Structures are given as structure tokens and as C-alpha cells.
């Protein structure tokens, strides 16, 4: 059954895939690179390419190759971020709040640069390790057993 | 297509303009069930199922929710909660000829009725009585399909009528087949209630200077309010000023 | 499951196959009748053989269905109309003998050629030779010679063949649970299983006899007036009957040829809009368009365009030969055409309107299954055609469409001439139809001995019709078989029944149209109520008993000539006034051959 169809190292192609509200969205970025082992330690943006009103409950994936290298796969967490839009709206830098306390300070101060000082970020809270229910004794049992163990009925 | 072998086409990921068809004025029947033809023109759907076939004139009324008859039971059935439309136009010059247009067939016998959106192609010899058919016609054994008789002389209820059922699907997936979204010429340097793909702002539009990104649609201010809009018709940015006002 | 459901499904499949097969046969017949070629005859034979084989196979496969356990009226009617074996009820030898005798007698009638003793080579057929001789020429000797030769060289040959055909028909009707083949033909009007509408075969005889008895005074006065007018005083006694050959035809069926000899007022011009039609440049297409406009005016739906693109209205040149006989082709599967060689005449105007009424009736019951896509009986469709032609023949209709100029006046003398001509056309053959049908009934049932057959005929000819043979004929003659229907196995009561039906329908329409004045001046133009009332029975066709349709139209479930009496009441009074000095009736004893 077909319900949809569409047709459109020296280089690194990066992609982000996510399904939200039945819309599958892909954000791509092709960049020139000069390295062969690991991801460059720099910064770049990802702009959207395709959104599809498919909503197929996608849970698994696998890459496809043609038989006549290496690649990297991460995962996405629901994090809070701060982004620095430049003069013409190009994402120049970003900070993840959950990374470390300094990052949390940057997030809560709305600035990539934080003036020297003391700053409150959150409120440490100790959650209940478990729950305990306490009641008096249950000694006062009703004569259900006598009906159960009734010799004469 | 034949009515028992009605052709289903799935339509999605495109703008559907029902206005031209509803206003083409070349059709015998136009019955949109549950939705006005003009209203559905400005309406979106995930899928459109076009079921095309040819029936007699008297069979056209059989193509409706909650209807009976040989066509409505053995050839094709419409659900009671039918939200689409039924369109029908004569094809006497198209699907009839002198001598009889016999290519079309209609199912007349079946062991049971048809489910909604169900197509029956089985040619099993229907057994009216108890005599086994054994693949051939005899006593109490007759072919489920009868050839349509279409000639340019036939009566109004007997002419070949092409009927397409447009069933509209709004499933969990987001809507794909929508309407033209009738655009309007825009103005500038004037207090105008503007709408750009749902922004529905109000104010004055002026020529902008800032440059958007190719994937970008509209701007925003530090206070998180709409300030700039790229025109969807032609790719250029326009600044937005709120409608002039003040104290007196 | 049940036998009734299996029979219904079998009838449905039979209709499915019959649609295509009969459509192919009808299109081949139309091609042959528009172009007479050898290949047309070949495909005619192929289609006829295929259709006959299919009908016989379906009849055999349906006869095993018992009709007594079937409660559906329409299904039972379809099964009884399909299972009618007919002549096949006999053995193959007897059936083929009957078919050969029928073919031989039809060939003798069609090729009946008489030669004058003056020139043995100079021979003429009945049509157009003898019919014109005894219809236009007024020479007593020539008409007598033509009549005697036609009944001699054909009757003598046909008498043994006709006797054998009669006995074979009687034995097959007996094998078909009929007392005689006359009862077999009367079974067409038979209605069973309907409360308050059942009709019996003997009821047909009773109704025909009663209607003829009612017409007897009017026919006696008309015969007296015609005899007084007749042209041939020496050979026609004023008290005696009329010669058979001096009635405009061999059998005296139609006396319209005597109209010139029996015109009430010769100085009064006859109503004919042919000259104005020529002035208005009306042709076959224009006449058909005006007729369609008239049919729409009464409320009937607009007629199809495939008719115009397929039907033949004029003579298709001379390269191809086409049948000029007026026919309304109901080819099936919605195919309706009219085959005519239409000229610019008022007669062709009326004939085209008659054929279009036929086509409207055919398309009315087109929604019925194949077995029910026919008229109620042999006299229903012709009644509709005749009433449509008569409505088209009214002076009001002609004046409304401009064919008859407004300055034309309608006087009593012109009305009397029109009524008398209509009488000679219609009621002239009613006594002849009654007597011939009674003779056929008695011949099939066997009351009339062979050595008395002709002796019986000329008896009632002098009594029922007041017609006397100019020269005596013995039993070697087969004068009844000299007619088309007797020599071709066709029921002759159909004309009397269709006359009664058309009079009843015309009177009912005029009552529904609220006509003011004489019945012969009644025009149903611009009367939607009359058209709707007619359609209420046209669509039924034969899906319902004809008695029910007759009740729905005229309020009477049975035949009656009261509409005929209303139509001819001015003419009846005029004839009674004229016959004050002319003996009314006839004398059976007197004959031209006895002095
Ligand atoms: C717009 O983004 C680009 C990417 O860094 C830069 O473009 C410069 O500025 C304008 C375009 O806005 C143009 O003169 C050139 O595209 C760039 N300048 C020069 C001298 O080449 C810049 O960062 C952004 N634009 C501005 C004005 O800052
Ligand atoms: C939508 O259609 C309009 C009408 O053609 C387009 O306007 C023209 O577009 C072409 C090329 O796209 C230009 O060469 C013309 O100059 C445009 N017309 C005018 C008056 O300027 C419009 O471009 C289309 N929309 C998009 C996004 O291409
Ligand atoms: C996706 O899965 C959820 C539960 O896991 C279910 O409720 C929903 O109907 C599914 N939708 C589709 C389109 O598979
Ligand atoms: C009676 O009480 C004893 C107490 O342990 C229990 O084990 C036994 O199942 C009871 N039997 C009945 C019949 O009540």
C-alpha cells in the first residue's frame, strides 16, 4: 500500500529526523570538511528540507547503501537551549542549559556572556525515595471464619 | 471503469479545486453529502478517493449513503457516513454507440451485499437454487455480471452515465489534499487587516530592507511579536507596523 | 432456494440475453429494410435463426418451472409468455407440415395473379393491380372479373391447404389445452389471477357480438345509404345486399373507395392541408418535429435525438431499396426508430403521427422487462396510434399550427362528410371483421362442415354484412383465405378490438381534456392532464392486465361502443334522416347472379 510519494573525507552531510504531530521533518546541512576520523569541533546550523504529513509511528530506522566507510548516530533529548541569531538570522552559536551549572546560568541570564557574580538557577529538591503507609493493627477481625468453618449450617 | 470494477484513484499532496468542477456545469448529478460544494473548496483533507464507473440513469440515485438496489449492493456500496461528493455526467457520445456499448458490465447477482468502498470482481456463477453451477450456466446458475447496453438512442434512465465518488479522508495523518486557498492582491502603506498563511495580522505593510533566509517565512521582534512577513506569492520581505493609534 | 426464486433468476438471465439478441436481430432487420441486399437477407436469416433457437431453448428450460406454485403475478405472466411452445407441441413432422402449409398459402396469396381471357400473358396481382381495378375503376364487368378470378385461382388452391392448416392448428391447440385454435388466439386477451379484472376467452366473443349488435342500427343505416348511393343501380337491388366486388375491394372490407360514389355532399371540399404544407415547405423532418411538439404539448416527454440520427423518414434515393411500409421500430435496449417513405401529404402527416404514438407507447413500457416490453394486447398500441393521428387530424390542430388557414369555416355539411368518410374507413370493416372472426372461430372449433364452409360464409355475408357475392362460389373456393390475415395466420379481431380501444381512449381523453362541442372536433393539444392520464397506462404496457388499463382510462373494465355512438351520433341522425325513403337493412335472398 502506497499513501505518499515524492521525488526531488571532503564533505560531511548531517541530518536530523523527527516526527511531531504526524509531521515528519528533516533538517539537513552539507558542509566541506578536511578530516577522516571524527566530527569537526566547530559549529554549523541545520535548516529544514522536507516535512511530510505521514505520521507512521516510526520507531526503527536503518541506513541504505549500494554494493558495487563510517558514519555517526546520536539521539535527541527534550532539552532547553539558547540560540544567538546573528544580524540576518543565521544561528551562530547555542548553549544547552542542562549541560552544566555554568550553562544553566547562561540560560537563566539570557546571555552567552555572564557577568561575575552569584546567580540563582533552580531549587534542589529531594524526592521521596519510596512511600510508606501506616495503620493500626487489624486484630479486630469479624467472624467470617466461623461462617466458613461452620460445622452446622 | 465498469461499476462492479470501479476504478479507485488516491489523490493527495496537491491542491484540489472543486470550484471549477462544481461550476463546470457539464454534469447530470452533483450531490455533496455532509458539506457544501463551495465550503469544501476552501477545505483540506488527507486523502481523496475518486471511484469512477459508468451506470444507467436510474442507477445514479442508487449511489448514495443508505441506498439499496443491485448497483448499491453488489456493484458498489457507499457508507452511511459519507462525507465526500457524487458527480455524474452523461457519456452517451462517449460510452455508447450504435449497435450497443457492451464493454461495461454490472454485477447483478452476489451471495451478499458489498461493504463500503469494496470492489467485487469475482465472476463466480451465482447459484440461485440448489443446482451446482460447476463453472457453467444452467438451471439456477447465472453469471453475476451482465453487459451494459448503451446506445445513443437509449432513454434518459438508460444512457451511459459516468459517475465519480469523491470520498474525503481526514485520518490521523495531517491533511494533504486541500483547496486553492484563494489568494488576494495585497496592498501597502495602508491600514489593512492582513493574513499570510494564518498569521492574520492587522496594520500597515511597507517595503522591507532586512533579508530573510530562503527557508524563512516571517520575522519576529525581541518581545516576540510579528514584525516582518515574506510574501508567499512572491519571495520578498515586507515590514509590518501596527495600526496607527494614540491618545486624544 | 425455492422454485419461484429460481424461475425469477432464470427469467432475468433470459431477459439479459434477449436484450442483446433481439437488438442484433432488430438492427439487422433495420439494415435490410433500409437497404435490400443479399447480405442483408443473409444477416436477417442468421439473426432470425439465432433468435428462434434462443427462444426455443429458453422456453424448454422454463417449462420445467411449475407455474402453480409461483405467487408473483408478473413472474407468472413472464413464464407463461416464455413457455408457450405453440406449434412445437405437436410432433416435428406435424409442425413442419403446418409451417410448410403456412408458407405455401402465404406465397399463393402474395403471388396470386389473375390473367384476363382476352390476353393470357396480361396478368395482374392482387396488389396493386386488382386492388386498384376494384377500388378506382368503376366498371362492373372488370371488377366482377377481377374478383371472380382472384377468388378462383387462389381460393381453389388454398382450400385444401387452408383446411389442412386449420386441422393442424386445431390439433395443436388441443395439445395446448385449447378447445380450438380460435380459443388459442382468444387466449391473448385472457386474464387470470386478478380479482375484478379476470377475462375469459369466451368473454371476447360475447363482447364482440354485443358490440356488433349495438352497432347494428348504425351499420344498417350506413349500408342503406351506401346502397341508395350505389353507381350500379342495375346490379344492386335497393332491398338486396351489396356485391362483394362493388365495395372498393375484393372482400368489401373498406368502403372508403365508395366514398366518391357515396359522398353526402360532393360540392363541399374536403379538409386537406397538404397544399398549405407545400406552401409552408413542410417535409418529413418538419412533420416529425411538429408531431413531437404536439406530443410535448399534451405532456409526453421530448423524443430522442438518436431517433433523428438513425431513423429513416424519406426515401433513401434509388441506389439502395428500402421498405416504404409505415413501421415503428422498437429495436430494444432503448432503440426507437420510425421507418417511413414520408411525402408532403396530410395522409403521411397522420401516418407519421400514428407511428410516433406507437414509438411513445413503446418507450413508455421500455422500463419493463423484455417479456413486458410490449402492448397490453394486439389492439392497444394501434389504438394509441389511431387516437394520436385523429387528434392530429382535427381542424383545430391544423389551424393552430397554421396548416389550416383561419378563414376556413366548419359547417354541418363538411362535418357530415368527415363523419361519413370516417365511418366508411372504420365502421365499414367492423361487420366484416366480426363475420370473418366468427367464421374463423367456427372453422377452428369445427361447427361449419367443410362441404358447407363457403355456403356458410355467403350466408352471413348477406346477413351480418349485407354483402352478396356477385356470382356463386362452391366449397372449392377459399374466399376467406383470399385475405392477408387468413392466409398468413393472423388474428383478425385485432382490428375490431383496436377500434373499440381507440374510441374508448379518445372519449376518455376528450373528457379529461374537457373538450367542448362534437366528439369529432375534440383536440387534445395543450392538454397536459390528458397526456398524463394516457401515460398512466402507456408505461404499463403488458405488465398489467389490459382490463385494468381500460378501467383506468375510461372507467370501464370491458369493451363498449358507446364512444363510437357518441362520435357518430350526428352522422347516425343524418343517415337515419336520409334513409327515410331508402330501405334500411338488406335482403339475403336476392343475389346479382339470380334474376
Ligand atoms: C548577513 O550574513 C552574511 C553571512 O555572514 C554576511 O553578509 C555580509 O553583509 C551583507 C549581507 O547582509 C553583504 O555585504 C555581504 O553578504 C556580507 N558583507 C561583505 C562585506 O561581504 C553578514 O554577516 C550578514 N550581513 C550583515 C549586514 O551583517
Ligand atoms: C505565481 O504566479 C505568478 C504569475 O505568473 C508569478 O509571477 C511571475 O513569476 C515569473 C517567474 O516566477 C516572473 O518572471 C514574473 O515577473 C512574475 N510576474 C510579475 C508580474 O512579476 C509568481 O512568481 C508565481 N509564484 C512564485 C513563487 O513563483
Ligand atoms: C501510533 O501508536 C499509538 C500508540 O502507540 C496509537 O494510539 C496510534 O493510533 C498509532 N497511530 C498510527 C498512525 O499508527
Ligand atoms: C477453618 O480454619 C482453618 C484455620 O487455618 C483454615 O485453614 C481452614 O481452611 C478453615 N476451613 C473451613 C471449612 O472454614
PDB file of N, CA, C and O and ligand atoms in Angstrom, chain A residues 144-150, ligand 4:
ATOM      1  N   UNK A 144     -15.943 -14.063  60.084  1.00  0.00           N
ATOM      2  CA  UNK A 144     -16.144 -14.685  58.784  1.00  0.00           C
ATOM      3  C   UNK A 144     -15.718 -16.143  58.796  1.00  0.00           C
ATOM      4  O   UNK A 144     -16.337 -16.974  58.120  1.00  0.00           O
ATOM      5  N   UNK A 145     -14.670 -16.465  59.556  1.00  0.00           N
ATOM      6  CA  UNK A 145     -14.205 -17.839  59.618  1.00  0.00           C
ATOM      7  C   UNK A 145     -15.229 -18.777  60.225  1.00  0.00           C
ATOM      8  O   UNK A 145     -15.344 -19.933  59.811  1.00  0.00           O
ATOM      9  N   UNK A 146     -15.988 -18.297  61.215  1.00  0.00           N
ATOM     10  CA  UNK A 146     -16.996 -19.150  61.836  1.00  0.00           C
ATOM     11  C   UNK A 146     -18.062 -19.551  60.827  1.00  0.00           C
ATOM     12  O   UNK A 146     -18.538 -20.689  60.839  1.00  0.00           O
ATOM     13  N   UNK A 147     -18.455 -18.627  59.948  1.00  0.00           N
ATOM     14  CA  UNK A 147     -19.327 -18.995  58.836  1.00  0.00           C
ATOM     15  C   UNK A 147     -18.595 -19.940  57.897  1.00  0.00           C
ATOM     16  O   UNK A 147     -19.160 -20.929  57.414  1.00  0.00           O
ATOM     17  N   UNK A 148     -17.323 -19.647  57.626  1.00  0.00           N
ATOM     18  CA  UNK A 148     -16.502 -20.520  56.796  1.00  0.00           C
ATOM     19  C   UNK A 148     -16.317 -21.883  57.457  1.00  0.00           C
ATOM     20  O   UNK A 148     -16.544 -22.924  56.832  1.00  0.00           O
ATOM     21  N   UNK A 149     -15.920 -21.895  58.730  1.00  0.00           N
ATOM     22  CA  UNK A 149     -15.703 -23.124  59.479  1.00  0.00           C
ATOM     23  C   UNK A 149     -16.948 -23.586  60.230  1.00  0.00           C
ATOM     24  O   UNK A 149     -16.824 -24.250  61.265  1.00  0.00           O
ATOM     25  N   UNK A 150     -18.137 -23.249  59.738  1.00  0.00           N
ATOM     26  CA  UNK A 150     -19.370 -23.631  60.416  1.00  0.00           C
ATOM     27  C   UNK A 150     -19.602 -25.130  60.279  1.00  0.00           C
ATOM     28  O   UNK A 150     -19.836 -25.631  59.175  1.00  0.00           O
TER      29      UNK A 150
HETATM   30  C1  LIG D   4     -11.032 -23.390  59.037  1.00  0.00           C
HETATM   31  O1  LIG D   4      -9.992 -22.556  59.582  1.00  0.00           O
HETATM   32  C2  LIG D   4      -8.662 -23.002  59.283  1.00  0.00           C
HETATM   33  C3  LIG D   4      -7.716 -22.085  60.023  1.00  0.00           C
HETATM   34  O2  LIG D   4      -6.438 -22.045  59.404  1.00  0.00           O
HETATM   35  C4  LIG D   4      -8.449 -22.988  57.776  1.00  0.00           C
HETATM   36  O3  LIG D   4      -7.141 -23.459  57.476  1.00  0.00           O
HETATM   37  C5  LIG D   4      -9.490 -23.868  57.099  1.00  0.00           C
HETATM   38  O4  LIG D   4      -9.355 -23.764  55.686  1.00  0.00           O
HETATM   39  C6  LIG D   4     -10.902 -23.447  57.506  1.00  0.00           C
HETATM   40  N1  LIG D   4     -11.884 -24.351  56.928  1.00  0.00           N
HETATM   41  C7  LIG D   4     -13.171 -24.026  56.774  1.00  0.00           C
HETATM   42  C8  LIG D   4     -14.045 -25.075  56.158  1.00  0.00           C
HETATM   43  O5  LIG D   4     -13.608 -22.940  57.126  1.00  0.00           O
END
